[PDB]
mmCIF file with all atom_site columns, C-alpha atoms in Angstrom:
data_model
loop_
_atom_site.group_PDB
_atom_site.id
_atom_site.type_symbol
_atom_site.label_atom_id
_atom_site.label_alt_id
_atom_site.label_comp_id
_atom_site.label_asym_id
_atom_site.label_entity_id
_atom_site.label_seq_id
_atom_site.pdbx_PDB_ins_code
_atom_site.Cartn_x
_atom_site.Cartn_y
_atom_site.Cartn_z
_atom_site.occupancy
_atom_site.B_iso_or_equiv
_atom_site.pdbx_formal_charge
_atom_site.auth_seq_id
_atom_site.auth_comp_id
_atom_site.auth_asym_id
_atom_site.auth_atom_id
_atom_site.pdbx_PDB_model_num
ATOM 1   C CA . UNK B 1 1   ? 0.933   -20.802 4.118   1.00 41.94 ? 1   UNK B CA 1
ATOM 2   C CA . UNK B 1 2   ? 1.720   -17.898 6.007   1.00 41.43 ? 2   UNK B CA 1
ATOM 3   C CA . UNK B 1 3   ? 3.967   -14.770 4.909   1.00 44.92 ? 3   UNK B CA 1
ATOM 4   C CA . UNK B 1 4   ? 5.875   -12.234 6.580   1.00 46.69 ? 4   UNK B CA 1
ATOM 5   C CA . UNK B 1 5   ? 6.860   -8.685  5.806   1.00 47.53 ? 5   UNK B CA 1
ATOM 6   C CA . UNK B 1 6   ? 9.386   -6.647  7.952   1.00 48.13 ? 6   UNK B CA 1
ATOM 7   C CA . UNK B 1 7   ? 7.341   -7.792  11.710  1.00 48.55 ? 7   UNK B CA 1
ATOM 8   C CA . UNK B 1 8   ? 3.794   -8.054  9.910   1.00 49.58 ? 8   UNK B CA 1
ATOM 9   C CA . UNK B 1 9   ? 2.572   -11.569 9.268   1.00 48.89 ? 9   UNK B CA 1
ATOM 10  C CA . UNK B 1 10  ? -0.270  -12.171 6.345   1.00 50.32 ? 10  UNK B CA 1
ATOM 11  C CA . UNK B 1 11  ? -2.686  -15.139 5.920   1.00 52.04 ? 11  UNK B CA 1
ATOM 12  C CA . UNK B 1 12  ? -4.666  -15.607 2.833   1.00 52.43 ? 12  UNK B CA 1
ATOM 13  C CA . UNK B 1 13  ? -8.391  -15.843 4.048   1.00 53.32 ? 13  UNK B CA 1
ATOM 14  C CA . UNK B 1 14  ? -9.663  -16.246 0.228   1.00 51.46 ? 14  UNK B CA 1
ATOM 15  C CA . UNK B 1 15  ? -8.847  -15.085 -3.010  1.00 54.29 ? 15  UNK B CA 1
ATOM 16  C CA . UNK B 1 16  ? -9.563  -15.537 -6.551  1.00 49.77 ? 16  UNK B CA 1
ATOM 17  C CA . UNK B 1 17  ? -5.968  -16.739 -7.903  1.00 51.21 ? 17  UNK B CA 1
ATOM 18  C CA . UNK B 1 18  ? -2.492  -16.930 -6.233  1.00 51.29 ? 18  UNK B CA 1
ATOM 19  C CA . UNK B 1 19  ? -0.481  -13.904 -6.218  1.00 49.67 ? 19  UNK B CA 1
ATOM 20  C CA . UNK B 1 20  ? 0.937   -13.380 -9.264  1.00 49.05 ? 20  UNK B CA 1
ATOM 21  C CA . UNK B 1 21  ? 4.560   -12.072 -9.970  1.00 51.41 ? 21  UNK B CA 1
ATOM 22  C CA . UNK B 1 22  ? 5.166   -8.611  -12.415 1.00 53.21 ? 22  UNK B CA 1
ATOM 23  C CA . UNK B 1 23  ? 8.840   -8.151  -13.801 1.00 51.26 ? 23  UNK B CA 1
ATOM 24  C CA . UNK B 1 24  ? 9.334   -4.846  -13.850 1.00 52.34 ? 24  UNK B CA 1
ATOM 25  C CA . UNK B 1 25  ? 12.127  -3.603  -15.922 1.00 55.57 ? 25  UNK B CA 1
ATOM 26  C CA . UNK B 1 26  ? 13.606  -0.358  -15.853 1.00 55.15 ? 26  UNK B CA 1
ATOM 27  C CA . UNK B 1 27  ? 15.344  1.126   -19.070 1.00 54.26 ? 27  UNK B CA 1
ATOM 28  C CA . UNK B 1 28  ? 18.570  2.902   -18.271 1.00 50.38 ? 28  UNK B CA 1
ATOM 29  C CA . UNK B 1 29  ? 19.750  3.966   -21.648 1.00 52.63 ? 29  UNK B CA 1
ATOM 30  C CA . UNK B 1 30  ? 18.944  1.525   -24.866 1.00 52.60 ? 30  UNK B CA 1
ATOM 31  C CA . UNK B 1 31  ? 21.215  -1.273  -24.360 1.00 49.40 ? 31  UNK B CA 1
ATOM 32  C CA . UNK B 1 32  ? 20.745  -1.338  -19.902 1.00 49.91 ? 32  UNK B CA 1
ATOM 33  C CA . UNK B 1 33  ? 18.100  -2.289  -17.912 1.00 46.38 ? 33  UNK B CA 1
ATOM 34  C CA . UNK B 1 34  ? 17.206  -3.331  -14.383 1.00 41.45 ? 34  UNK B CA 1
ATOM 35  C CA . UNK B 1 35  ? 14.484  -5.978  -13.797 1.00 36.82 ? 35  UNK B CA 1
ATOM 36  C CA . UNK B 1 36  ? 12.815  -5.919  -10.557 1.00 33.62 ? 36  UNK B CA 1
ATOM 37  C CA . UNK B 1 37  ? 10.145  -8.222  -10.198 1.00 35.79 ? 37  UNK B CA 1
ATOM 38  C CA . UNK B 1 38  ? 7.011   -7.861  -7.672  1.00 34.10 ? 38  UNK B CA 1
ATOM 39  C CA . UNK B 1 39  ? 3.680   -9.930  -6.234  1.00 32.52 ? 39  UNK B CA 1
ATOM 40  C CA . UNK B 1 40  ? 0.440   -8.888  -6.315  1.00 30.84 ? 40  UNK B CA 1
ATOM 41  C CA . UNK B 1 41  ? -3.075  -9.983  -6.327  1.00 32.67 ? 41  UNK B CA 1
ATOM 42  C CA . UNK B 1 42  ? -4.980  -10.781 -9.532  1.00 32.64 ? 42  UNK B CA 1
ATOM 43  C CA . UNK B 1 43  ? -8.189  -9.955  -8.700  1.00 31.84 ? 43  UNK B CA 1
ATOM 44  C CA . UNK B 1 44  ? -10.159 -9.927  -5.090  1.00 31.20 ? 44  UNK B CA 1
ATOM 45  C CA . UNK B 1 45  ? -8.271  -11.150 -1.824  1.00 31.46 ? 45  UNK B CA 1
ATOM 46  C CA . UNK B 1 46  ? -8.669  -10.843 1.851   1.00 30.63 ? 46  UNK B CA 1
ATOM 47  C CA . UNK B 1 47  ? -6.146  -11.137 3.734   1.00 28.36 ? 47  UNK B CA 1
ATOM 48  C CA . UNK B 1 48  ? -5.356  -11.732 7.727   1.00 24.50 ? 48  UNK B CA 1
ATOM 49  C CA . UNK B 1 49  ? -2.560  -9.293  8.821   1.00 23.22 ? 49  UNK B CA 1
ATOM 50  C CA . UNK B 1 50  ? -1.238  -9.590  12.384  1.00 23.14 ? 50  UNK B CA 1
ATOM 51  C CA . UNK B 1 51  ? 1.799   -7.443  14.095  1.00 20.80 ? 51  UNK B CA 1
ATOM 52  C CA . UNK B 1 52  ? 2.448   -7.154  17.730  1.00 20.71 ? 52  UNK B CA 1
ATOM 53  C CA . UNK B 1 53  ? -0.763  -6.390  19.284  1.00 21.60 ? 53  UNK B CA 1
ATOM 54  C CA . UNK B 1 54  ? -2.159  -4.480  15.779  1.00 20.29 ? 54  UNK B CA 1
ATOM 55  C CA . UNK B 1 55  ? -4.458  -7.130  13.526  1.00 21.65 ? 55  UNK B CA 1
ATOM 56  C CA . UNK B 1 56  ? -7.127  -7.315  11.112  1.00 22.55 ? 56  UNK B CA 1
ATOM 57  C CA . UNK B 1 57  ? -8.004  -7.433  7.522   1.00 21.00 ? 57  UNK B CA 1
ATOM 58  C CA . UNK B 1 58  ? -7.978  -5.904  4.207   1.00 23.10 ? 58  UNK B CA 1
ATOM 59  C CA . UNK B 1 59  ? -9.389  -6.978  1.044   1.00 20.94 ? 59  UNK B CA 1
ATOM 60  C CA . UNK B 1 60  ? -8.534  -5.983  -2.198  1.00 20.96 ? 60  UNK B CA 1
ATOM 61  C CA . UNK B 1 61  ? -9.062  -6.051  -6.142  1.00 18.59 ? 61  UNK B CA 1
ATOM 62  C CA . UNK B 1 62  ? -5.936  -6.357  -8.309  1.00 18.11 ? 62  UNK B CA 1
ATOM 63  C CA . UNK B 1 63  ? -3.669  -3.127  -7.085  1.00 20.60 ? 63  UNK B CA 1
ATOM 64  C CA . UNK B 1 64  ? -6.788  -1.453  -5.197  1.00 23.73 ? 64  UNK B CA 1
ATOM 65  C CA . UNK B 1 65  ? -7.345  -1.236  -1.131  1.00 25.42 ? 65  UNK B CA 1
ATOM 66  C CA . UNK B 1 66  ? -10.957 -1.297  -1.154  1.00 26.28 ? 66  UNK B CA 1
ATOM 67  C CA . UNK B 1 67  ? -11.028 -1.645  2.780   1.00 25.38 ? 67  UNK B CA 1
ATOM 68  C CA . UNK B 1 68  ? -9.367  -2.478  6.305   1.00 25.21 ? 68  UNK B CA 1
ATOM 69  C CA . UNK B 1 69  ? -10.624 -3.563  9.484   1.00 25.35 ? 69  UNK B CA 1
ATOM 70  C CA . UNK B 1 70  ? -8.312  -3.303  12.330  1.00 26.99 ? 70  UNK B CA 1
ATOM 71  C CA . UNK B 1 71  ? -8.467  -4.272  16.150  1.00 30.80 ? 71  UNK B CA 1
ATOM 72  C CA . UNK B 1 72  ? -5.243  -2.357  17.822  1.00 30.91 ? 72  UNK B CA 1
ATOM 73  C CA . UNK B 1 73  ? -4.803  -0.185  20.822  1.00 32.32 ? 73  UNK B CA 1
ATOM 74  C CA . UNK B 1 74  ? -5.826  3.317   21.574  1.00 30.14 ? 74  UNK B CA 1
ATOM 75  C CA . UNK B 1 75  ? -3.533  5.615   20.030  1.00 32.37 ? 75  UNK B CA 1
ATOM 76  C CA . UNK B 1 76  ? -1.660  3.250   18.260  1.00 31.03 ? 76  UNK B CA 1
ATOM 77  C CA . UNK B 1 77  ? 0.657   4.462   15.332  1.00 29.36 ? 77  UNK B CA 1
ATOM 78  C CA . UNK B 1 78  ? -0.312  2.166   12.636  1.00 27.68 ? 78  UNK B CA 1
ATOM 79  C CA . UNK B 1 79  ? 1.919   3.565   9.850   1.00 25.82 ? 79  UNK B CA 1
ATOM 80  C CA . UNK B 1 80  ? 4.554   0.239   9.978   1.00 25.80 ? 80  UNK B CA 1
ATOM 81  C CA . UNK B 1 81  ? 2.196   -2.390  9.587   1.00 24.29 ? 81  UNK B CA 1
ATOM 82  C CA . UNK B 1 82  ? -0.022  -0.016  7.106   1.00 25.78 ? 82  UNK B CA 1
ATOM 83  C CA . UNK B 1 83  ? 3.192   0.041   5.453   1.00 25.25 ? 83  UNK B CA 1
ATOM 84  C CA . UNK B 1 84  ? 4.056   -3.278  5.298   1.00 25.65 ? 84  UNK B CA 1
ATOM 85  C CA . UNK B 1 85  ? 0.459   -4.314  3.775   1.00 27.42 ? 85  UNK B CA 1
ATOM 86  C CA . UNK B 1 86  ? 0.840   -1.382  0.952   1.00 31.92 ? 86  UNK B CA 1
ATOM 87  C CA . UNK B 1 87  ? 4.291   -3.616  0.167   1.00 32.10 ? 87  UNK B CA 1
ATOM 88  C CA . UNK B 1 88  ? 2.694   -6.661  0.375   1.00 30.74 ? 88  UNK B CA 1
ATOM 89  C CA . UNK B 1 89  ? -0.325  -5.898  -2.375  1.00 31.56 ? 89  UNK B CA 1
ATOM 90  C CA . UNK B 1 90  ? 2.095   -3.352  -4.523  1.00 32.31 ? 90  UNK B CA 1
ATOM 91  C CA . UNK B 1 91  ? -0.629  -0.622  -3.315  1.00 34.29 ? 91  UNK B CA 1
ATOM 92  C CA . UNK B 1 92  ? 1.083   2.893   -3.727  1.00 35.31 ? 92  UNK B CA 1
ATOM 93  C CA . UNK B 1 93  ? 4.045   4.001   -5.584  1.00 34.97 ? 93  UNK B CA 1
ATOM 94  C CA . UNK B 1 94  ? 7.005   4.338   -5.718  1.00 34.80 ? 94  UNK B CA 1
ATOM 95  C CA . UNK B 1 95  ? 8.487   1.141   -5.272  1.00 36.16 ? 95  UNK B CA 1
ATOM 96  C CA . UNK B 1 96  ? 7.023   -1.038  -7.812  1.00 37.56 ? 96  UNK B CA 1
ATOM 97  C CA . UNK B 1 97  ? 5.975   0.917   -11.541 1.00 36.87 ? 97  UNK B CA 1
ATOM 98  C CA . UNK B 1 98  ? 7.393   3.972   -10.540 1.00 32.72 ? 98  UNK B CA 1
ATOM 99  C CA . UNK B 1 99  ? 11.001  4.948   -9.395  1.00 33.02 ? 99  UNK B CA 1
ATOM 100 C CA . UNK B 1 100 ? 12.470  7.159   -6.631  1.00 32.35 ? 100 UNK B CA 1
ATOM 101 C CA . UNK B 1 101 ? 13.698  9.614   -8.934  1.00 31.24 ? 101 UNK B CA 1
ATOM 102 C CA . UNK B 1 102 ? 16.854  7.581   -9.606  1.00 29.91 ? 102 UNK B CA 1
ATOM 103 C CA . UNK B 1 103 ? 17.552  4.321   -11.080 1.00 29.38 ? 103 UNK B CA 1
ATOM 104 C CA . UNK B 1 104 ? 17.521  1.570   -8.635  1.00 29.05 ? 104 UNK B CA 1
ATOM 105 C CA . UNK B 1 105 ? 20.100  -0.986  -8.387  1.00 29.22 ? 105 UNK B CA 1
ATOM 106 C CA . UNK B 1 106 ? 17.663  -4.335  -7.891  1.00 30.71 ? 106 UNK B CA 1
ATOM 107 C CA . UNK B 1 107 ? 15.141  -5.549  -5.388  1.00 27.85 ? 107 UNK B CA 1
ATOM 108 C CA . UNK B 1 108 ? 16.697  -5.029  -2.311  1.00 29.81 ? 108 UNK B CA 1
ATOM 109 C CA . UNK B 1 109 ? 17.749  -1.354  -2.861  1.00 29.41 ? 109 UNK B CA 1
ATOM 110 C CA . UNK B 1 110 ? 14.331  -0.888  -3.865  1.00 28.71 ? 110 UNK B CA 1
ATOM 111 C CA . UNK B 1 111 ? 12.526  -2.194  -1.156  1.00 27.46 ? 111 UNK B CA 1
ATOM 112 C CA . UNK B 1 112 ? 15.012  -0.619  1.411   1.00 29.29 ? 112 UNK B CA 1
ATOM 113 C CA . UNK B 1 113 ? 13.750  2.703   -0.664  1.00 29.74 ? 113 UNK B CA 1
ATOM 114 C CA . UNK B 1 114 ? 10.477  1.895   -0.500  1.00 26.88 ? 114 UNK B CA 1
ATOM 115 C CA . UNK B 1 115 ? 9.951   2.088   3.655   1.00 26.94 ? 115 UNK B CA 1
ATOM 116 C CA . UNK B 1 116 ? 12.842  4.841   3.852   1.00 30.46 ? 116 UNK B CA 1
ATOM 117 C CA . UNK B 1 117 ? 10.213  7.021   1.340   1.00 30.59 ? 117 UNK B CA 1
ATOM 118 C CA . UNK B 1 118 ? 7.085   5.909   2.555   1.00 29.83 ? 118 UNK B CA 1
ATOM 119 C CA . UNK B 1 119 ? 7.947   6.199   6.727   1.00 27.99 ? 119 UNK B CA 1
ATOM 120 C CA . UNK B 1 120 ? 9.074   9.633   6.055   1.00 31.55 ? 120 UNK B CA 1
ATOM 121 C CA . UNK B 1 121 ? 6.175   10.911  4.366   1.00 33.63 ? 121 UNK B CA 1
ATOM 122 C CA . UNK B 1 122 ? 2.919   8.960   3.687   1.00 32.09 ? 122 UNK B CA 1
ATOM 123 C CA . UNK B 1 123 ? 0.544   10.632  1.559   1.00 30.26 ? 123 UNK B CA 1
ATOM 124 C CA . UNK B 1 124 ? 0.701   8.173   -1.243  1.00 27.94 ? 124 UNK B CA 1
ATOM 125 C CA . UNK B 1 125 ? -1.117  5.666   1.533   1.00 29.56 ? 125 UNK B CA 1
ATOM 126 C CA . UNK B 1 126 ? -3.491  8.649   1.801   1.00 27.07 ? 126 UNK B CA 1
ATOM 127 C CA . UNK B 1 127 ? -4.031  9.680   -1.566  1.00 26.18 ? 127 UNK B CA 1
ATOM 128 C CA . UNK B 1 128 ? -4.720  5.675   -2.128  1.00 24.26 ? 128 UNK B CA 1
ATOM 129 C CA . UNK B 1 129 ? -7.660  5.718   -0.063  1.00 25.58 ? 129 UNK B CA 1
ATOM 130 C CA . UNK B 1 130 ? -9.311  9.107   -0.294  1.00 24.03 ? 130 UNK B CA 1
ATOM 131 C CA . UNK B 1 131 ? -9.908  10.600  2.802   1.00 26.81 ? 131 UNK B CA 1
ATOM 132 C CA . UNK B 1 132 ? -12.912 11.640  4.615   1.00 26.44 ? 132 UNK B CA 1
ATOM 133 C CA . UNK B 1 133 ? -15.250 14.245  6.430   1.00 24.81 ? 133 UNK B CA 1
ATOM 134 C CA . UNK B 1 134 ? -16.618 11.705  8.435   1.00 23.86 ? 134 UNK B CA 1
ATOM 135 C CA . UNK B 1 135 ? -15.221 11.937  12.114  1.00 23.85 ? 135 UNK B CA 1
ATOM 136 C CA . UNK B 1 136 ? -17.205 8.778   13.283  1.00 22.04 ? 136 UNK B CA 1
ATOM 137 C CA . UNK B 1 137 ? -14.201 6.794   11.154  1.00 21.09 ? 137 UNK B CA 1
ATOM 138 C CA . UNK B 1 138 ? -11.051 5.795   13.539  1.00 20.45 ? 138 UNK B CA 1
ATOM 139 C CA . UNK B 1 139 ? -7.816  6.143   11.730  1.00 18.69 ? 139 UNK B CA 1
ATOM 140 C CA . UNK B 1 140 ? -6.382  9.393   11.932  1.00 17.29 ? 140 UNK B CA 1
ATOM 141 C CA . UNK B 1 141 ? -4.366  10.959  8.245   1.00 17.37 ? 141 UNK B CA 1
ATOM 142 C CA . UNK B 1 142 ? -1.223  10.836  10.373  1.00 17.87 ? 142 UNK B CA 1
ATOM 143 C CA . UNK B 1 143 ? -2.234  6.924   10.714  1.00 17.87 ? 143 UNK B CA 1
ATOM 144 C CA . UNK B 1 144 ? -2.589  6.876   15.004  1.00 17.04 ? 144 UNK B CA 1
ATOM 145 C CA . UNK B 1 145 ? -5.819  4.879   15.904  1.00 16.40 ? 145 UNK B CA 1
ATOM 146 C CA . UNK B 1 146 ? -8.761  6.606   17.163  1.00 14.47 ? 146 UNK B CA 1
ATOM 147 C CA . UNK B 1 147 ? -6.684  10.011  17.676  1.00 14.49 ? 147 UNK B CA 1
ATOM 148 C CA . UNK B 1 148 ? -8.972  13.173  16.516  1.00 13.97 ? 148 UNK B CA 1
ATOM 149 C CA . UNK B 1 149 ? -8.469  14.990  13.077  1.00 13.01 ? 149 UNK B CA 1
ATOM 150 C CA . UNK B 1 150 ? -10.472 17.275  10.888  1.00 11.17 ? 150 UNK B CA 1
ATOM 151 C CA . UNK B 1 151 ? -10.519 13.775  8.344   1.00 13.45 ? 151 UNK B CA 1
ATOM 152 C CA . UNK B 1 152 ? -10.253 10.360  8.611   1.00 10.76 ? 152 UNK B CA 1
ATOM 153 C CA . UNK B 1 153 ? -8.744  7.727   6.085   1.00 10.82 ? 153 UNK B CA 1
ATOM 154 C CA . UNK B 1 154 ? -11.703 6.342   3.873   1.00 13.29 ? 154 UNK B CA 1
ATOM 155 C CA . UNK B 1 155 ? -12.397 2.628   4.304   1.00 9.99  ? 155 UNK B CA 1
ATOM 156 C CA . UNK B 1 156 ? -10.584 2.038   7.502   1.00 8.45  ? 156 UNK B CA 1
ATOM 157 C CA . UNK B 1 157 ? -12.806 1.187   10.077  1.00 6.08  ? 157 UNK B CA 1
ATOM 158 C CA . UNK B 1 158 ? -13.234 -1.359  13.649  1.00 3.64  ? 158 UNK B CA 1
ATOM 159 C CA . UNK B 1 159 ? -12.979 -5.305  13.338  1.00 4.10  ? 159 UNK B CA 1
ATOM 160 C CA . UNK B 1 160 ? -16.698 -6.060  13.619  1.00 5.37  ? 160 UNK B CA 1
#
């Protein structure tokens, strides 16, 4: 049942269809290419998502966050896991349509790439969700929980 990525753990609560698998391929020149298949949803999901002492949900349609409800500590910094769910629905690029501005090798190079790119600088997890002017909201655009900013990440909000 269960699935793991990196130290985060996902459950399926419900979804429309299994995950589905996209291979990618890559052209290098006419005659070379690199496939590098990837999962995703096809259509709506929720989905349980559990790491340490950081849990909650997220539901989605097809390649679209459309929200997340988290329980976690005070000041937590929730980019890994956040991370780690992005991966697991193919959320934000690059690391699944879209390149790192080289040609990758195969999957694991690319995945490596993917939470090198993304740890570093996370905007593409921003830009993915909008953000917002609504202070009330608890996750933070440098992704700490509850910590005060002049915006907050759209759609993220506390486990009921």
């Amino acid at each position: 049942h269960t699935m793991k990525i990196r130290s985060t753990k996902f459950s399926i609560l419900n979804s429309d269809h299994p995950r589905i698998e996209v291979k990618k391929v890559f052209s290098l020149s006419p005659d070379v290419q690199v496939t590098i298949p990837y999962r995703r949803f096809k259509g709506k999901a929720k989905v349980y998502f559990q790491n340490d002492q950081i849990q909650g949900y997220f539901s989605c349609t097809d390649r679209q966050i459309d929200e997340i409800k988290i329980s976690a500590p005070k000041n937590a910094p929730l980019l890994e896991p956040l991370l780690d769910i992005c991966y697991y629905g193919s959320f934000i690029e690059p690391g699944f349509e879209q390149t790192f501005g080289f040609y990758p090798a195969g999957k694991r190079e690319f995945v490596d790439s993917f939470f090198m790119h993304h740890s570093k600088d996370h905007k593409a997890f921003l830009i993915h969700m909008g953000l917002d002017k609504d202070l009330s909201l608890p996750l933070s655009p440098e992704l700490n929980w509850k910590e005060p900013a002049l915006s907050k990440v759209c759609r993220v909000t506390e486990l009921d």
